[PDB]
Write a protein that binds this ligand. Structure first.
Ligand SMILES: C[S@@+](CC[C@H](N)C(=O)[O-])C[C@H]1O[C@@H](n2cnc3c(N)ncnc32)[C@H](O)[C@@H]1O
Lengths: 128, 32, 262, 224
C-alpha cells in the first residue's frame, strides 16, 4: 500500500535531522531556513540572553559574551535582541540595571501598551 | 565609505554590524 | 522577425561552413581499400599520424548492422601508427565503459568531449503545422538541403528523442582520447571552437550527421592540430588518418582514408 | 570637520531604517511565515566522512520499510573540496539494493567517476548533459585546454531489478538546455526528470545546498 509522505518525513526528521531543523513533535523549523547559516539565534541563545540580563547588568554585553553564551556571540545582535525583548527601540534608560524576568515581561507589556495608546506600536517596539 | 554597506546581497544584520563599526571608527576620529 | 528565432539563430554556422569540393589531384589524398580493418595491419600503409578519426557504426541491438567492442578489440593500434596523437571515435550509451576500457588498455587516455545536440527537421515541421493551422508543404530532407528552417523560439520540443529503455537518446557523443608522449610535443591550437553545437537531423536517421556537421567536425580536428594539415612537407607523410571511411564526405586534403570492403 | 558629522546623521538614519527592517523581519518570522523549503523535506546537516550511515539505514528501513531508489551526487572534486578516494570510500552499496545513481562529473573527473560508480556495483546505462544557455538563448561560453567548455555531464549507474515496478521507461531527455545561475547551481529540470523516472519513491542526495531541498528528498550537506 502507498504511504503518506508527511508522516514519513516527520518520522525521519525526528531521528535524523538536528534539533535546529525540526520543531517539537516532527514539524519543520522554518525560521532556520529563513536565516543564513550561522545566525539562527536558537531558543537556547534567547534563554541565555534572558539569563544574562537576569544575572549581570544590561548594556554590559562583554562579560556576557565572554562567559555566558559560548565565548563567541554576535555583539550588536545582542543589543538588537535585547531591544526586541523589551518592546522599546532603545535601551538608554535601562543601562546599568539588572532587570529580573517578571520585571522584564512587565516592562515589555508596559512599553507595548504605552506605544498602543499613543500610536507608536510598529512591530511591537516603541520609538523614542 | 558607505559602499560596502550599500550592497544588496548583504542581510540586515551584517549591514547593521557594518554601520556600527563605521560609527565606532568615525567616533574614534571624532575623539581625535 | 526573420533571423532572430532560436532555431534560426543557433544555426548560422551552417551558413558559415559550406563544404568544399573533391580533390582531383592524387598527391593531396591517400585512399586505401581493405577487406577487414580489424584484421588489417595499417602500419604498412601509414605511419606517425596525429589524428585518427574512427567513423565506426555500432549496432548494440544484435539484429542490426554495425560493429562491436570485439571488433574494436581486434583492431590493432601501435606506437608506429600513433606515438603522439589523438583518436576521435563515435561513442554510444551502453558501451561507453567498454570503449574507455579497451582504449585505455592501448595507452590512450580520455581528455575531452565534443557532442552534437540533435534537432529534428520533421518535428519542427509538425510544430509549424500545429502552430499555423502556404510555405510549409515540403519534405524534411529538402528542409535540411535548402537551409529553409521553421521559426522556433523554444528548441527543447524538437529534440530528436529516439526510443530507449531509459532517458530518451538526444545527443551524439564523439570521444576524444590523447596518447601522450614524453619525447615529442604535440602542437595544438586551444579553444578555437566550442565543445557543443546544434545540428538538424531526421527522425528516421538520427545517427547520420549532415555534410555541414561532418565538415564542422573535420575543421574542428584540423584547427585543433594545424601541423597535421596539408602542406608541402606532408607529401606522402599525412598526419591524419581515417578508419571505416565512406564515399559520402571523406576524401580530403592530407587525410589517409581506409575503407571497409568497397 | 563636519562632513563626517553629516555622515553621522545619515548613518543614524540608515541605522534606524535597518533597525526597523530587522524588527519587521524578526516579527514576521515569529509569526505565520514559512520559508521556500518544502515541509516534507528531510535535511541532514553532517559531514559525510563523520556521518553514521547505519543510523540512516535503520531509520529508512523503519519508517519506510524499504530502501532508497535514487541517489543523486555532486561530489566536491579536488580540482571545500574533500578528496578523490574519500568519495569512493562512501557506503553506497548499503544504501541501495535496487535503483539508480546520479553522479555529476566534471570534465577532469569523468573517467574516475565512471570507475567509482562501476566499483560501487552499478552499471553505466545513461548520461545526462546540461548545456548552458544565455538570456537570448545561446550556447553560453567556455574555456579549456582543447575546447571551450559549455557543457556539464551527469553519469547514471543502475542496480538490481529496476524493471520490477517503481520506474518508468522512455521518459524525459538526456540534454538539459537551461541557463546557468548562482555559482555551482544545477537546474531543477534534473529533479523533474528524476520525478518522471521515479514517481513518488524514496530519494537520497549526499552533497546538498539549501536550494537542493525538495518535498520527497533526503538531503545531506555540510551547511544544509
Ligand atoms: C560540491 S558543491 C555542491 C553544490 C550543489 N551541486 C549545488 O546545487 O549548489 C558544494 C557543496 O558541497 C558541500 N560539501 C563539501 N564538502 C562536504 C563534506 N565533506 N561533507 C558534506 N558536504 C560537503 C558543501 O557544504 C556545499 O553544500
Amino acid at each position: 500500500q502507498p504511504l503518506d509522505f508527511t508522516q514519513y518525513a516527520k518520522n525521519m526528521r525526528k531521528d535524523l535531522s538536528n534539533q535546529d531543523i525540526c520543531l517539537e513533535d516532527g514539524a519543520l523549523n522554518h525560521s532556520y531556513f529563513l536565516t543564513k547559516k550561522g545566525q539562527y539565534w536558537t531558543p537556547l541563545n534567547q534563554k541565555a540572553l534572558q539569563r544574562g540580563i537576569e544575572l549581570f547588568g544590561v548594556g554590559n554585553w562583554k562579560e556576557i559574551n565572554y562567559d555566558e553564551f559560548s565565548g563567541k556571540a554576535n555583539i550588536v545582535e545582542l543589543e538588537l535582541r535585547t531591544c526586541m525583548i523589551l518592546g522599546i527601540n532603545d535601551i538608554t534608560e535601562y543601562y546599568g540595571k539588572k532587570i529580573s524576568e517578571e520585571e522584564q515581561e512587565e516592562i515589555k507589556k508596559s512599553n507595548i501598551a504605552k506605544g498602543k495608546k499613543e500610536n507608536k506600536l510598529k512591530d511591537n517596539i516603541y520609538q523614542k | 565609505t558607505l559602499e560596502d554597506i550599500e550592497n544588496e546581497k548583504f542581510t540586515n544584520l551584517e549591514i547593521l554590524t557594518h554601520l556600527y563599526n563605521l560609527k565606532a571608527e568615525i567616533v574614534r576620529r571624532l575623539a581625535e | 522577425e526573420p533571423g532572430e528565432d532560436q532555431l534560426s539563430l543557433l544555426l548560422k554556422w551552417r551558413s558559415s561552413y559550406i563544404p568544399p569540393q573533391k580533390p582531383t589531384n592524387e598527391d593531396e589524398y591517400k585512399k586505401i581499400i581493405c577487406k577487414d580493418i580489424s584484421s588489417e595491419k595499417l602500419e604498412q600503409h601509414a605511419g606517425d599520424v596525429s589524428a585518427l578519426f574512427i567513423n565506426i557504426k555500432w549496432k548494440l541491438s544484435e539484429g542490426q548492422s554495425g560493429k562491436s567492442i570485439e571488433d574494436l578489440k581486434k583492431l590493432a593500434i601501435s606506437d608506429k601508427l600513433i606515438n603522439n596523437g589523438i583518436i576521435f571515435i563515435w561513442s554510444e550509451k551502453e558501451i561507453l565503459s567498454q570503449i574507455v576500457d579497451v582504449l585505455e588498455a592501448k595507452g590512450f587516455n580520455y581528455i575531452e568531449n565534443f557532442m552534437i545536440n540533435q534537432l529534428s527537421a520533421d518535428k519542427a515541421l509538425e510544430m509549424q503545422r500545429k502552430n499555423q493551422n502556404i510555405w510549409s508543404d515540403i519534405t524534411p530532407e529538402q528542409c535540411i538541403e535548402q537551409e529553409k528552417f521553421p521559426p522556433n523560439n523554444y528548441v527543447q520540443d524538437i529534440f530528436v528523442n529516439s526510443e530507449y529503455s531509459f532517458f530518451r537518446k538526444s545527443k551524439k557523443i564523439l570521444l576524444m582520447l590523447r596518447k601522450f608522449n614524453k619525447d615529442a610535443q604535440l602542437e595544438l591550437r586551444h579553444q578555437r571552437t566550442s565543445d557543443i553545437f546544434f545540428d538538424i537531423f531526421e527522425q528516421n536517421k538520427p545517427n547520420d550527421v549532415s555534410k555541414k556537421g561532418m565538415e564542422f567536425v573535420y575543421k574542428m580536428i584540423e584547427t585543433l592540430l594545424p601541423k597535421a594539415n596539408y602542406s608541402e612537407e606532408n607529401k606522402g607523410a599525412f598526419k591524419m588518418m581515417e578508419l571505416y571511411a565512406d564515399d559520402k564526405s571523406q576524401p580530403r586534403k592530407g587525410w589517409i582514408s581506409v575503407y571497409e570492403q568497397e | 570637520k563636519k562632513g563626517l558629522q553629516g555622515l553621522l546623521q545619515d548613518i543614524e538614519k540608515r541605522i534606524l531604517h535597518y533597525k526597523q527592517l530587522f524588527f519587521k523581519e524578526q516579527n514576521e518570522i515569529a509569526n505565520g511565515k514559512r520559508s521556500m523549503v518544502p515541509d516534507n523535506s528531510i535535511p541532514i546537516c553532517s559531514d559525510v566522512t563523520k556521518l553514521n550511515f547505519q543510523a540512516l539505514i535503520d531509520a529508512q528501513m523503519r519508517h519506510a520499510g524499504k530502501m532508497f531508489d535514487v541517489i543523486m551526487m555532486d561530489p566536491p572534486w579536488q580540482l571545500d573540496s574533500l578528496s578523490d578516494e574519500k568519495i569512493q570510500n562512501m557506503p553506497i552499496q548499503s544504501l541501495q539494493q535496487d535503483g539508480f545513481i546520479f553522479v555529476w562529473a566534471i570534465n577532469a573527473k569523468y573517467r574516475v567517476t565512471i570507475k567509482m560508480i562501476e566499483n560501487w556495483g552499478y552499471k553505466l546505462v545513461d548520461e545526462i548533459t546540461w548545456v548552458k544557455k544565455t538570456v537570448n538563448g545561446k550556447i553560453a561560453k567556455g574555456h579549456g585546454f582543447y575546447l571551450q567548455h559549455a557543457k556539464e555531464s551527469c553519469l547514471i549507474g543502475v542496480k538490481g531489478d529496476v524493471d520490477n515496478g517503481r520506474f518508468k521507461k522512455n521518459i524525459a531527455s538526456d540534454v538539459i538546455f537551461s541557463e546557468r545561475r548562482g555559482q555551482s547551481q544545477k537546474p531543477e529540470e534534473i529533479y523533474q526528470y528524476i520525478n518522471q523516472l521515479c514517481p513518488n519513491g524514496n530519494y537520497l542526495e549526499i552533497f546538498a545546498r539549501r536550494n537542493n531541498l525538495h518535498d520527497n528528498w533526503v538531503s545531506i550537506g555540510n551547511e544544509l
